[PDB]
Design a binder for this molecule. Structure first.
Ligand SMILES: Nc1ncnc2c1ncn2[C@@H]1O[C@H](COP(=O)(O)OP(=O)(O)O)[C@@H](O)[C@H]1O
Ligand SMILES: Nc1ncnc2c1ncn2[C@@H]1O[C@H](COP(=O)(O)OP(=O)(O)O)[C@@H](O)[C@H]1O
Ligand SMILES: Nc1ncnc2c1ncn2[C@@H]1O[C@H](COP(=O)(O)OP(=O)(O)O)[C@@H](O)[C@H]1O
Ligand SMILES: Nc1ncnc2c1ncn2[C@@H]1O[C@H](COP(=O)(O)OP(=O)(O)O)[C@@H](O)[C@H]1O
Ligand SMILES: Nc1ncnc2c1ncn2[C@@H]1O[C@H](COP(=O)(O)OP(=O)(O)O)[C@@H](O)[C@H]1O
Ligand SMILES: [Mg+2]
Ligand SMILES: [Mg+2]
Ligand SMILES: [Mg+2]
Ligand SMILES: [Mg+2]
Ligand SMILES: [Mg+2]
Lengths: 370, 370, 370, 370, 370
């Protein structure tokens, strides 16, 4: 039996089989529930859709992300998303496959415990392991030395690792990801006239963010550039036909990451959380962690940040240490690639949580086995 | 025990049997009472002629539609029309058949209640189920994604259905139909010299509108084209012998549908209530509601309406969207065809409002069962 | 050079000068020809007597109204009547005076066009303006908010006006006026034993009606009262010398106005056309349209109509509403008084249809200038 | 001279003089354009009435609010409304008075820009300041620690303010106000039969809502109470005369505010947007934002709002937190009262936007000066 | 001239007059500045609140401790805290009283130099003296022989003293105090669900630690106890209103002090730094320093450490030596009590650094006078 690696994140579930380098199931993890009066007899109107189905039939559905800020808020639907992923998208009875879930660091223990309990008492997988959603990024990037920076529709990490030796006192978790970027974009668009309120329109705002937003390289100059028109404005055609021209509010949606005094948070940007994470590391380590800031996650796929993070940190690091921002052009999947790599290594077969061990020690065995 | 489907509109009562695709009884719903003095010791002149009887004997009678503007204002003759439809055209036993009445949306609740009470206390049918006259149009056209326009002689109402799920918050009932067009025609004919005042002549005006009126593809240019004489004139030979030539006032009788400012109605034409009923729907829905503008009812059988409708909508829809008016040539009975289809569904035979339920919980069961 | 105004009704043609409150010329618009054989070489035997000249010699002539039911059915005699009105009572030079014709609403456009053609090719008046016969009544009453009611020698029309904005969708024309009341009186008189068949007989019947008919305030009470002989009889003396006593049929003749079933007509009485015209108007209008039921024409001079109409309307109006029928004593000429008023206004002099405009644009200018 | 405070809302223009506590001119902000055919050459027919004039002459005009959902959609008539409310209402040259307009939060920048450009290049006022419509509500209620709910006829927005420091990241704009309540009422009346369609009838429906509609204290209980007849029935007498008995549909018109699932809107009621606006504030601030829920705007003058609101909030707030709702009896004008107070303060006397600054930098000054 | 004794720690400033036994001014040393958007004109919103004034209005402020790890990091705000203490909390003039500051041992010399330079060139006090924060603890305890252990919110340092002769080669300093304990509690709390990030919530975390944390006696036994739930759990009530059950992590927050391998530090616990400080003394001293382990500072006020530090030391010290932990109940204010005892002494009255000596010797006179 081959090992199943499902990067169950807070945005779109990225699941697939081990060994490969591309997940087979990439669908937004939303559970849609109809809200309008349904009047048609012969139709098989399913009472709750999930995934790309509930993404394409939006105009009837009240979408509901079952994971808010990395943690699982609503279980009864995340169970349905796992059901869909296992059966209707991969077609593999989970009783005959190991499982490799993931979990952002610094999350409640109830989350991980109940994830294990569900995966063992509803799907009865033979073995399940949950790795940190940011160590697999290094396992994929091939290194064993770099301050990872996860992101994307959920939380944001900074997990320094010197030589496969994570420093659990310098993981600077921050919940300022694409979801808050979207809830700020759909609030700055209003200043122009376009009003998106529902969830089916929040998805349109997220698509605008995806294929139209870039990170400035000097915000206080891009602003003054946006005074007299330029190549800033770029029309986008909503799924009903009308267009939108967003000139100013396209390098302010992802620049919240570097200035969180916009959406109201206090904690500094993702350029200063990395620096504080490094300054929480030893002196014989900083001088080399400065040289590989391996990125990850969706949110870090802007045509900006991959090259402004370097300037922001060079304005903070000593002028001698060499700064490098490893920006793999596949970082959107680096976490699952790392999961699939780690699940293949033979040295890892001792790491699974066999069903016998869970049965003998209850669900609270993960806190020691992972 | 087969089901009975009778779309008792404001004009022609269209009754028949389920499964089949042609209404058995298609006759106008009028109840005439003789007004003159009958002096004949043998002629058994019954005090009321109903339907085609009163349509054939018009010079002696006082025709009176029982259904005015969708609602029922005179019950003691609609009851007689139902009795006639059952016992003289279908020649059936009502207590041995389920009934499927219809009703335009946004009608008073008292109308539904008294309708079901009559059906359960004057014919004692085992189970009757009413339905919105728009859903049956999609049932007939074999769709689930349309925006209906059923406008038969009493009302007009665009009910947008996306995928089996009606959007009750964005329907546009309009109180202007073939009857108001007939009134406007018998009022615009006096402009030329032909005087029709009585009801037996109003029926002649309606028969003029039916066959000699058409919708101008460009009304403000047709008004100038028909100024200088052309092939615009026609000639309808009245049942008296004298012929009349309705030159210009034949694309002005159906142009009220698009400019209701003619008969004083402040509301918008049937081309703009559709656009508003769409722009009240969701953005992820407008794209494929713009594509299926299923038309129903009689008044939408003018020669040039399925084209001017598309023109007027394209004049105000987003320029990158595809518009298409699904106009099946057999639309005049499309409501009843959809009714016969719906009563012939396996999953539908539970929706009936059985006589047991009415005797158990009173006539107000319909408001919650339909 | 002042202007002229001739309310060319179907009966008495009222003509005069713009500014005075008295039509100089009043005479029945009857044109008659001798029908017997005349053998008197010396006597000045005319060829065709018109107006009062023909009214005063009936036993020899055969009278002919050119304006039947409001429309001009005969042109080569209405032209004679206009010529007589201009060259025997007013004696004016039509080339030196503008004329203000009148017309009832909802009349064929042939009347308008041929009236303009006659006035601009047979009298060469500088400027003619034809106005509706109800707006003039409101002018004469000096109001701006009333529901007019004009009737005489065959026409009846309620034109509701709120503040100069005449509602063109709520006018209620009706051919149930003095001419038809006379035709019913000369047919009910044959019941008692008096025979009137010819046109001189019709004139005698009209003179009977004008001074011996009144509108009953309670039809059934009156029929039950006059069934037992009382003081209801009123002896009239024909010019022959025979005396007749029209006991009962002196309120049954003007009762057709409120029960048009007598002449077989189907349309409602004038007490109900008014209420239907009001219920065709808007809700913010009805409240103060009920309070001005301004009447006009001759047939509204029956000694009991200004109160029976109020009773009948109050019977079917909202109970908390005020119905103040404005029936001034000088209503028989209200149309022409309003004509003289609105022709003597400062800002009206631009409204005329000058001869230049007709010469440059044809006789079809009325349909746009009126 | 003295400053002008004109709370140009989406309903009634509530304008007046600063320092006082009563707006001199409250009148609905509608622009009526007559639609019927106006034929009376005597009247001085003003072609565009505006305000209470166009509210008194409704049966003739086409009422058209120039502000749809807080934003100004039609400028060319809002300019006329400003012209009227200055000259024909307050009789003051605008060039000799400072102006204090208001504007709901989260509105397009174009709105403020064009508002300032009009106020400076059409009336040439010496100085104009525009402030958010909730800060003024706090100024009026005296506090500096509240979470406003100013919701009148077009918008609804909770602006939490802890100590003079607004939290811009926690405003909840919602377009579910009086206008949508009125539309839902004129759509729900059709349950019984009363059919209001035109704008002169939309005004009647609004006048029904604002005096016979109350908010239930337990909606599911009141629905069942209304089954068996009780004091729920109330009679309103239309301006036409006929009365209507709105039995059940009088606590369903304002219950939309707490279940916007009725108009199909997805966003939760105004009882949950307040709670979300608070749960977006800080932990030590919620303690005394839960205690001052200052209410404002028209739509919060229903009888049973200030109690069902508190019930709903205590139903989802911590059981040890004190929930108060400051509902001042003069809350209809509280925004204008706050405006007058604010313009009557020395520390604000320097915060105007003088004509000099606008002339020197253009209309784009407001974005930074307000 | 009476002596002013202000003990500027890194937590709560404890100032007051000499002679007494309780500081008159105890308030957290935090300079807060607003971070939100102030929208008010009347309010006097000061730009930087300092002290417990900046603790009531905590939801608006970015609290910034001006003393990080004993040393003074930011000076422009520490000057403000001194300003507040001297004027708005004691109402004394600085040039009217001798000042007695303090300083933890082994701190940068620039710190003390600029402290004196401020006290003499900004406040211009007559005479100022700065003494170590442990010999004052000994004065307060009334001895001249003891291994002081001062540990409050910042640094932790042992200063062994045999008989008035401090041994400056055994002052084991370690920065693992209350501030690091709070930054570790707000990180161990995340594992349970409660997420505190901002400084305003970090103060709530510190207030949790203050009145809910206790030191275990056998850490492993307590951990094994917390597995099978016991009465360990307590419910603290945030100012939000909700309650938190911190079961396990209430003896893991103050057990970092004895196992610094939790925050990743390497230096031994405070139970072993005292032992190494003693073993750095002489043989004829240890046998008596083992008996006077005078505690001090805030963080030594747990319901734990005393009866646990005694055990941990007896597990290290030789058997026949006698270990006694002098733990007075006022050890929170021990440093200031000792300062007030010292400043009121005769012999000490020659130790002051008068303004005279500082002038003709520079700010570097402290390095010989202290
Ligand atoms: N091409 C892109 N450019 C910028 N942002 C993107 C892009 N694609 C996705 N995103 C953002 O990143 C998120 C996906 O992050 P991802 O790492 O897949 O989440 P998860 O960790 O839950 O799988 C999306 O919600 C979107 O907001
Ligand atoms: N061939 C036709 N062309 C144009 N209009 C027609 C035609 N046939 C019927 N109509 C109009 O349609 C009306 C009948 O519509 P219908 O759908 O039967 O009404 P209902 O829904 O009340 O049954 C008639 O009153 C007539 O005005
Ligand atoms: N005193 C009267 N009482 C009753 N009816 C009268 C009286 N005088 C005239 N009439 C009726 O009024 C009619 C005259 O109306 P007329 O003024 O010609 O109408 P119009 O204004 O359309 O020309 C006559 O035919 C006659 O029947
Ligand atoms: N007495 C009342 N009771 C209930 N609702 C009212 C009352 N008066 C007004 N309203 C509603 O409030 C609206 C007026 O709100 P208002 O705050 O004046 O609007 P604006 O903010 O534009 O001035 C009206 O449209 C009406 O629907
Ligand atoms: N009752 C208490 N229980 C436990 N810890 C406390 C208590 N009171 C204060 N503390 C801790 O001690 C610190 C105060 O120590 P203190 O000696 O006053 O600091 P400083 O040396 O800066 O004056 C606080 O930050 C808090 O973490
Ligand atoms: Mg993640
Ligand atoms: Mg129909
Ligand atoms: Mg007339
Ligand atoms: Mg407002
Ligand atoms: Mg201390």
């Amino acid at each position: 039996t081959t090992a199943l690696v499902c990067d169950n994140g807070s945005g779109l579930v990225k699941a697939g089989f081990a060994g490969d380098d591309a997940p087979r199931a990439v669908f937004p993890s939303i559970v849609g529930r109809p809200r309008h009066q349904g009047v048609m007899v012969g139709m098989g109107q399913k009472d709750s859709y999930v995934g790309d189905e509930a993404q394409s039939k939006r105009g009837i559905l009240t979408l509901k992300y079952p994971i808010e800020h990395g943690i699982i808020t609503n279980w009864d639907d995340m169970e349905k998303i796992w059901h869909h992923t296992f059966y209707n998208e991969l077609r593999v009875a989970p009783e005959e496959h190991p499982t490799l879930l993931t979990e952002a660091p610094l999350n409640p223990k109830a989350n991980r415990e109940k994830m294990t309990q569900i995966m063992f008492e509803t799907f009865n997988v033979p073995a399940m392991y949950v790795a940190i959603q940011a160590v697999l990024s290094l396992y994929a990037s091939g290194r064993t030395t770099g301050i990872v920076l996860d992101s994307g529709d959920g939380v944001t990490h900074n997990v320094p690792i010197y030589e496969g030796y994570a420093l659990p006192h310098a993981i600077m978790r921050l919940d300022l990801a694409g979801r808050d970027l979207t809830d700020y974009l759909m609030k700055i668009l209003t200043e122009r006239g376009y009003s998106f309120v529902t969830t089916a329109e929040r998805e349109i705002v997220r698509d605008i963010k995806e294929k139209l937003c870039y990170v400035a390289l000097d915000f206080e100059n891009e602003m003054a550039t946006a005074a007299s028109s330029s190549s800033l404005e770029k029309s986008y055609e909503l799924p009903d036909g009308q267009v939108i021209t967003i000139g100013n509010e396209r390098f302010r949606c992802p620049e919240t990451l570097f200035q969180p005094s916009f959406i109201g948070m206090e904690s500094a940007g993702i350029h200063e959380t990395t620096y504080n994470s490094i300054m929480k590391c030893d002196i014989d380590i900083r001088k080399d962690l400065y040289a590989n800031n391996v990125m990850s996650g969706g949110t870090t796929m802007y045509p900006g940040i991959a090259d402004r993070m370097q300037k922001e940190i060079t304005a903070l690091a000593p002028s001698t240490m060499k700064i490098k921002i490893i920006a793999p052009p596949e970082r959107k999947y680096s976490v699952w690639i790392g999961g699939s790599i780690l699940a293949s290594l033979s040295t890892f077969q001792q790491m699974w949580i066999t069903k016998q061990e869970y049965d003998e020690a209850g669900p609270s065995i993960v806190h020691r086995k992972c």
